[PDB]
Structures are given as C-alpha cells and as structure tokens.
Subunit: 83 residues, 2 copies
C-alpha cells in the first residue's frame, strides 16, 4: 500500500471546499485544514504507486483551487519481492 | 485538545530510531517515515497550544537527530459535521 501525505496551499477561502471535495473521494482517508506554512494536509491511500500517480494526475492536478502542493509518500509492502 | 502534524527533517539513518522514541511519547499518536520534502511526519495531540509549543521546542531538542520541524495545527478536519 502507498500512503501519501499531501500538504496544500489553496485559493483564499476555498480551504473547507477543497477539504470536503477531497474527502468525498475514496482514496482520501483523512484531511485537515491547518494553520502553518500550508493550508491543508491530506492523507491518501492507494493499492499501488500507479494508482497514486493517477489519483494525483486526474484529481489533484485538475482542481484549480489547489495552488501548491508538497507530497510525501510512505510505501508499506511486506512482500515487495514476492513475485 | 489540540491536534497537529509535525513535519521533520532528520539526519540520514536515524528515522526509525527517532520514530520509535517518538511513538513511545504520550503526545505522539502516529508516526510515518516518508520520502519527499520531509523525512518523518508525526501526528500529535496535546491539551493546549502551550503544551504543543513546549513539545516542539523542548522535547524535540532531546533528539538532535531531528534537524528541522515545521508544525501544521489542525483547525478543521474530517470529523467536521461527521462525528
Ligand atoms: K473518503
Ligand atoms: K504514543
């Protein structure tokens, strides 16, 4: 599984809008509007790296309200070499 | 209760050592080794902001392996209207 924590800057006044639009997506497990250097921190989980890159490409990158991002990934695979 | 995510830059090779020392702390609820702008992400809950401030500037300094932190205070999250 791949977990991504994405820090985001949004357009002014669109923080909650972005938070809820993201939470309506199945891949988004948690989301927080925050006070700090960024406006939100969002937790995403996908089965594969391919799934995460597709999620970012079709969802995140096509939401004009999201203006800046910083992505962090944790890959948790207990059998990465089991093929 | 205050909820926050502390993003950390750590010296290389000390992530898990620090992660385990962090997870053992009562304030620390979740910790993840990650790849990206930061090396470690930790979710903390404290009674007050003053407590969070002391954790960030005093407790974290007990681990010099942690070189930089940026903290995001949650002001809205996924339990809004959903609790
Ligand atoms: K969701
Ligand atoms: K703990």
């Amino acid at each position: 599984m791949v977990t991504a924590f994405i820090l985001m800057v949004t357009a002014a006044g669109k923080e909650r809008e972005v938070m809820e639009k993201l939470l309506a997506m199945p891949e988004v497990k948690e989301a927080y509007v925050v006070y700090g250097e960024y406006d939100l921190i969002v937790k995403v989980e996908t089965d594969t790296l391919k799934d995460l890159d597709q999620f970012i490409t079709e969802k995140i990158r096509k939401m004009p309200e999201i203006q800046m991002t910083s992505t962090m990934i944790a890959i948790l695979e207990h059998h990465h070499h089991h093929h």
